[PDB]
Design a protein around this ligand. Structure first.
Ligand SMILES: Cc1cc2c(cc1C)N(C[C@H](O)[C@H](O)[C@H](O)COP(=O)(O)O)c1[nH]c(=O)[nH]c(=O)c1N2
Ligand SMILES: [Ca+2]
Ligand SMILES: [Cu+]
Lengths: 313, 133
């Protein structure tokens, strides 16, 4: 079998030049889950120009300078995390792939997280002044609590432990942005920036699959390790999540200072921390009480929270 | 005679939830060449795979449709529990409502991924009451 006596180009490039290279085979697929994920993320392609954000201008103009600044700062903070994941995190995953299709899926992830970062620019172009935009960039660069979070993850991407790299790649879409995503849903629950909330929902439709996929590939690798090494990796996941929850809480108390949103934003964060653990195959230790947010805000995430011709009847 | 019929893809999220439940379970095969015959009453537990497109097409996994298409299997369904992820918004766990509509059976519960302690305790209780009443 050609496959068992050849390597993918990215394996050849970085790990093993002792074998000839095989072209990707989309006709004989090792893992059908890869085709599942590829079809959905490519079929779910979108650009922020698709959304008429200009229709948010009325509700935006009703917000005072403090709330407009909060939104610009929050979204510039999320832009940073998407820039990290697009330019470093997702592309770093390609060479650590279990399958050929996984390599191409992570190239799609890197591109689409790039579109996420770009979408905030589209909102700012419509709603914000040049002064509001520049101020938010200055604030992000100078906010040490904000900077601490990506500074904690980037080393795993550039280091040579692929499992730790994978956990970091899952934690970014799985947890780290949800404290920020709280704000648009809080506002759209009050009928403010409804079109902005449509962009956030398109972003989440991608990030949910990104977290799932990274968590799925993490589980396949760790399953092959000894019970001792599996316990070692579980220990590392909880230790890292503890650190990241600590850094996120510190940041959110600074971001939402004087607005009174930090507490609910942190509960929404911990809800998603619970789902991150589940996507890695670990039980969530968080209480339904610890993770509860107001129903009117949760309804903005999912109203459901409250056909194929193969059907024969 | 407490029984679960469930579907789970290769990710095995629904499989792991169902194995935490007290009731006996039977898995609908992933392989589309394979089918099962069930002649006892069951609660159906399935994940959603529409993918948040704006659209209930592919919401119910094809293997679950194939299973329910057999009227002998169909007639034994007491109710449907669906799973997914709230990040899919309007498409969250919509396999349940779709099945609930098609079979004219109650949507008993909705949960996420491998489920929490609370989900296990609730689904155990709901499955008990479903087979009594
Ligand atoms: C491609 C794709 C598409 C979807 C999903 C996932 C993936 C990978 N999932 C989430 C999914 O139902 C969830 O992860 C389940 O826990 C998976 O169960 P199994 O692991 O297959 O048993 C999902 N969830 C939801 O509520 N609505 C949906 O439309 C979809 N669609
Ligand atoms: Ca564009
Ligand atoms: Cu992502």
């Amino acid at each position: 079998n050609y496959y068992d006596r050849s390597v993918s180009p990215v394996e050849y490039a970085y790990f093993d030049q002792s074998q000839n290279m095989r072209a990707i085979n989309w006709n004989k697929i090792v893992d059908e889950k890869d085709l599942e994920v590829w079809n959905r993320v490519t079929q779910n392609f979108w650009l922020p120009e698709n959304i008429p954000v200009s229709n948010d201008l009325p509700s935006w103009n009703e917000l005072d300078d403090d709330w407009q600044q909060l939104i610009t700062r929050t979204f510039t903070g999320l832009t940073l995390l998407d820039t990290v994941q697009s330019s470093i995190g997702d592309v770093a995953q390609i060479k650590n792939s279990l399958t050929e299709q996984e390599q191409v899926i992570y190239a799609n992830f890197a591109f689409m997280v790039g579109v996420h970062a770009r979408s905030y620019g589209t909102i700012f172009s419509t709603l914000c002044t040049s002064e509001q935009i520049e101020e938010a960039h200055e604030w992000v660069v100078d906010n040490e609590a904000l900077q601490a979070r990506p500074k904690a993850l980037i080393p795993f991407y550039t280091a040579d432990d692929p499992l730790k790299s994978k956990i970091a790649a899952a934690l970014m879409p799985g947890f780290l942005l949800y404290g920020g995503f709280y704000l648009p849903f809080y506002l759209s629950a009050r009928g403010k920036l409804p079109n902005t909330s449509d962009i956030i929902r398109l972003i989440l439709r991608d990030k949910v699959i990104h977290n799932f996929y990274s968590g799925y590939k993490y589980q396949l690798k760790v399953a092959k390790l000894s019970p001792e090494k599996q316990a070692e990796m579980k220990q590392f996941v909880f230790d890292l999540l503890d650190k990241m929850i600590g850094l996120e809480k510190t940041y959110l108390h600074q971001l939402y200072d004087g607005f009174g949103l930090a507490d609910e934003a942190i509960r929404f964060s911990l809800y998603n921390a619970g789902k991150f653990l589940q996507n890695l195959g670990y039980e969530s230790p968080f209480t339904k009480e610890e993770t509860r947010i107001a129903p009117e805000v949760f309804a903005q995430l999912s109203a459901r929270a409250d056909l194929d011709e193969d059907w024969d009847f | 005679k407490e029984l679960i019929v469930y579907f789970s893809t290769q990710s095995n999220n629904t499989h792991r939830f169902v194995q935490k439940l007290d009731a006996e379970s039977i898995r609908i095969p992933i392989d589309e060449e394979e089918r099962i015959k069930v002649d006892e009453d069951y609660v159906l537990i399935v994940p959603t795979y529409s993918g948040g497109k704006v659209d209930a097409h592919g919401a119910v996994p094809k293997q679950v449709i194939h299973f329910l298409n057999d009227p002998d299997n169909r007639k034994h369904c007491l109710g449907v529990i669906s799973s997914g992820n709230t990040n899919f918004g309007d498409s969250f766990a919509i396999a349940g409502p779709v099945i609930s509509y098609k079979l004219k059976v109650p949507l008993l519960y909705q949960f996420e991924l491998i489920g929490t302690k609370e989900d296990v305790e609730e689904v155990n209780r709901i499955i008990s009451e479903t087979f009594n009443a």
